[PDB]
Amino acid sequence: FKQLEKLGNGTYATVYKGLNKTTGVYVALKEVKLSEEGTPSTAIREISLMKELKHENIVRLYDVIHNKLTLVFEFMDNDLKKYMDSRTRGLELNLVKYFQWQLLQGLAFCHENKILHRDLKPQNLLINKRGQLKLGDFGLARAFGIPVNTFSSEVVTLWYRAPDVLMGSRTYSTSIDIWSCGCILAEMITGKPLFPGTNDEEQLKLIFDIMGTPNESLWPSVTKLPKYNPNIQQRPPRDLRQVLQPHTKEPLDGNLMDFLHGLLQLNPDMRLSAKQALHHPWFAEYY
Amino acid sequence: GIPKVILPADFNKCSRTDLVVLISRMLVSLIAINENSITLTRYHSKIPPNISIFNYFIRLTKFSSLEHCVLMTSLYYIDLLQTVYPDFTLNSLTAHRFLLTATTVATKGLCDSFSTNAHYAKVGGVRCHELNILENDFLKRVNYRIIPRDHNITLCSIEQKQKKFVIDKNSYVNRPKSGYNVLDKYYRRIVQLVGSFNASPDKSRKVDYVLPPN
């Protein structure tokens, strides 16, 4: 491999674009800093799970190269966040549907192998020159088929985080990823993020200003959440159509809307499953 | 006469002192057999350490907050390494260093709460660097295939670097619990083999262990 351009960054890794020396195949070399922490736990987790996730909608890990450690990922051109910036405005609805198809397809695979991504956002939704969408960066992901005690992790933005997770929940299941999907969706539809919060407190408030405050009645589990407040000013849910429609060039049909509500229930158990999502009347014409 | 504690079906709902006695038991039973039956490895000590496996095992547990599934995983990692690192056999020269290693790869690999190698090396008795290369060794030999799953070992064996022979030697769908049936399988096994008081490390904890016949 011969590196030929840096692409992004973090405190964990420095990512470059390179080339295979047999097939002309372009690759993304992800150099992981290799230390009192030994072999970055984040790598052990990524490398580990990637080997376990082969799908046409999950970025592939080709190999590992060993005082450093380079993760060789299948090179992807840009990402949902970067792809949208290029327009300026939300994407046209036939393209909005297809992208949401691809994301749910790859995630439905994760969830089937009992693995949560945990941090889905448009940067993590990479898109090749050929219009394919693939989930990437499984640093914060876990094989939840291994019943270990769950603690959440510090993330750079909270705009895609489930309200219950933000309320300190440590028994969340596969439903954490479905919330992010409903936010990814609204974003693609409108252009702007659905819950552009600044912090733990604001994000929750911003969810409740639209989704309504939690319905203790049809969600009794919420009273057990560590960051739960019984003395919140109760809010009626604002109907999503009058929030999105003003900022989407095309009319929002009923199907699209039922689908969207199905993803953005407050109560995890009311949240649609990835499998169930892919058989919603909204995706009928794909069959 | 000796106490008779009945364990639960789910190993998580079970005292992790019990698991540390159950595993240690299984460990010295392997150590006896594998021996009473030589290119060295990184898991080799110059001489058998003067601390029994159990007393070393609880220590790691107490002062590194080793979760249950990690304790089960640790045991499993023997069968892994023993199947894919020809050179490696569990024996009174490999137990400790292997254990220290396994333990801290299981945690860092599979868990949400974890320490630094520098923390783990201290409790384990080794220099930090000792543990770093010891951790790196394992990950290379196992090809990072650390998630205990039904077909994991096989897939690890297949993903090895393969000798070319003249004659070639010749999806978790529908599989129960998506192929995460390994750690229970091990839990049930050690209660079946070393569950009674007749194994070898009698000294450790005087108890017979039962598991409801279900």
Fold of A1-77: Phosphorylase Kinase; domain 1 (3.30.200)
Please count the residue pairs, one from chain A and one from chain B, whose beta carbons lie less than 8 angstroms apart. Answer: 91
**Resolution, angstroms, 1 dp:** 2.9
Experimental method: X-ray
Question: Can you read off the two tokens belonging to residue A110?
Answer: 């994760």
Nearest to A36 among B12, B116, B144 (CB): B116
Specify the number of domains making up chain B.
Answer: 1
CA distance B116 to A40: 9
Does A245 touch chain B if contact means CB atoms closer than 8 Å? Answer: no
- Tokens 């088929």 belong to which residue? A145
CA distance A157 to A140: 14
According to DSSP, the residues that pair with A55 across neighbouring strands are A58
In chain A, residues under CATH classification 3.30.200.20 are: 1-77
The DSSP line for B141-183 is HTTT--S--TTHHHHHHHTSPPPPPSS-----TT-GGGG--HH
The DSSP line for B15-72 is -HHHHHHHHHHHHHHHHHHHH------TT--SS--SS-HHHHHHHHHHHHT--HHHHH
Closest CA to A143 of B182, B186, B101: B182
Based on C-alpha coordinates, what's the Rg of chain B? 18
CA distance A50 to A38: 20
Asked whether the CA dihedral A225, A228, A234, A237 is positive or negative, the reply is negative
Per CB-CB distance under 8 Å, the chain B contacts of A66 are 136, 140
- Residues 6 or more apart in contact with residue B165 via CB below 8 angstroms: none
**Pair type for strands B4-6 and B208-210:** parallel
Nearest to B180 among A48, A114, A151 (CB): A114
> Which domain, by its residues, includes B40?
1-214
Is A8 marked as a binding-site residue?
Answer: yes
The DSSP line for A245-282 is GGG-SS---HHHHHHHHHH--SSGGGSPPHHHHTTSGG
Peptide-bond breaks in chain B following residues (C–N over 2.5 A): 37, 170
Q: Let me know: does B147 contact A48? Beta carbons within 8 Å.
A: yes
Could you give the C-alpha distances from A197 to A163, A187, A205, A255, in angstroms and in order? 12, 14, 9, 28
Question: Can you read off the two tokens belonging to residue A242?
Answer: 């009058």
Is A7 marked as a binding-site residue?
Answer: yes
Could you give the C-alpha distances from A112 to A106, A144, A274, B200, in angstroms and in order? 10, 11, 9, 42
Q: Which residues of B touch A (CB under 8 A)?
A: 12, 67-70, 73, 105, 108-114, 116-118, 128, 131-132, 135-136, 139-140, 143-149, 172-173, 177-180, 183
Strand, helix or coil at A64? Answer: strand
Biggest CA-to-CA distance, chain A: 64
Which CATH number is B160's domain given?
A: 1.10.472.10
Count CB neighbours of B19 within 10 A: 24
Q: Catalogue the active-site residues of A.
A: 119
Q: Which of A194-198's residues contact partners 24+ apart within 8 Å by CB, and which partners?
A: A194/A159, A195/A158, A195/A159, A196/A159, A197/A158, A197/A159
CATH architecture entry for A78-287: Orthogonal Bundle (1.10)
Question: Can you read off the two tokens belonging to residue A151?
Answer: 């603690």
Nearest to B135 among A36, A38, A52 (CB): A38
Is A97 marked as a binding-site residue?
Answer: no
CA distance A137 to A80: 14
Q: Let me know: does A250 contact A240? Beta carbons within 8 Å.
A: no
Is A67 marked as a binding-site residue?
Answer: no
